[PDB]
From a paper:
Addressing the elusive specificity of cysteine cathepsins, which in contrast to caspases and trypsin-like proteases lack strict specificity determining P1 pocket, calls for innovative approaches. Hence, we set out to determine the crystal structures of cathepsin complexes with representative peptides of cleaved substrates.
The pattern II group (binding shifted to the non-primed side) consisted of structures of nine protected peptides and one non-protected peptide that all bound uncleaved into the non-primed sites. All peptides bound to cathepsin in the same manner, except for fragment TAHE, which bound to cathepsin like fragment VACK (described in the pattern I group). Two peptide fragments, VACK and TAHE, were the exceptions because their main chain ran into the S3 binding area. At P4 and beyond, the features of the electron density maps became weaker and less precise; however, it was possible to model the peptides KPKKKTK, RLSAKP, GNYKEAKK, and EVCKKKK up to P8 in the averaged kick Fo-Fc omit maps. MPD molecules were bound to the primed sites of all structures.
Numbering used by the authors:
A (entry chain AA): 1 to 222
B (entry chain PA): 753 to 756
Write the structure that this text describes.
């Protein structure tokens, strides 16, 4: 039996909201967000991880830095590489640069990753409730998303299969008193704390996989 | 060229 609502931010699994600025690296922020929660689950220590390390070093795994990428390829790089540096030691500059991965500054590892069945929102609910934050892709290509402010986000022109933006599901919940009505996914974005609701968005949940939230979800195995 |  899964809980009626989950919010990993209230348990110390989530770093403050970051900002990718003018670089298509949301895939990297989604990936660091998920690894941050799994390393916290493992050691009890919350340590911000380096998106720039992923931008600069994971081209061999199929990512293209500020030109886009995929969270699964990022978890694959961390596995193959044997580590990932901290935000502090390998700072974010939002441009493609030379790979300067330093093993002595690594604060995270993974052995691969687990995938949630494509399009299965209840499989994603189970992953969120039992594992921690989950990396997901969504269709964020709309002005309504760009100017989102509060409430449950629902966009008619949203696609559940052609996705363009990586984010992190940190929980789920509902509004009102009926735990099965007007449900939503709690999602951390990487456009800074100033965007949306303190950097977060509530996306309609159990409404036919709105915006593709459960189409390509995964988490790193630590 | 993927997610951005
Ligand atoms: Cl992915």
């Amino acid at each position: 039996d899964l809980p009626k609502s989950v919010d990993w931010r209230k348990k110390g699994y989530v770093t403050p909201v970051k900002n990718q600025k003018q670089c298509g690296s949301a895939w990297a922020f989604s990936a660091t967000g998920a690894l941050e929660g799994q390393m916290f689950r493992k050691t009890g220590k919350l340590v911000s991880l380096s998106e720039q390390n992923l931008v600069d070093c994971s081209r061999p795994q199929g990512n293209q830095g500020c030109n886009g990428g995929f969270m699964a390829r990022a978890f694959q790089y961390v596995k193959e590489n044997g580590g990932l540096d901290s935000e502090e030691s390998y700072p974010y500059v939002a441009v493609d640069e030379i790979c300067k991965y330093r093993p002595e500054n690594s604060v995270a590892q993974d052995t691969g990753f687990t995938v949630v069945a494509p399009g299965k929102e209840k499989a994603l609910m189970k992953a969120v409730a039992t594992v921690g934050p989950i990396s997901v892709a969504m269709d964020a290509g709309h002005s309504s998303f760009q100017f989102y402010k509060s409430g449950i986000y629902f966009e008619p022109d949203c696609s559940s299969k052609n996705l363009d933006h990586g984010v992190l599901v940190v929980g789920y919940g509902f509004e009102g008193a009926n735990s099965q009505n007007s449900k939503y996914w709690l999602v951390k974005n990487s456009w800074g704390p100033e965007w949306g609701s303190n950097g977060y968005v509530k996306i309609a949940k159990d409404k036919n996989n709105h915006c593709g939230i459960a189409t390509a979800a995964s988490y790193p195995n630590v | 060229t993927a997610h951005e």
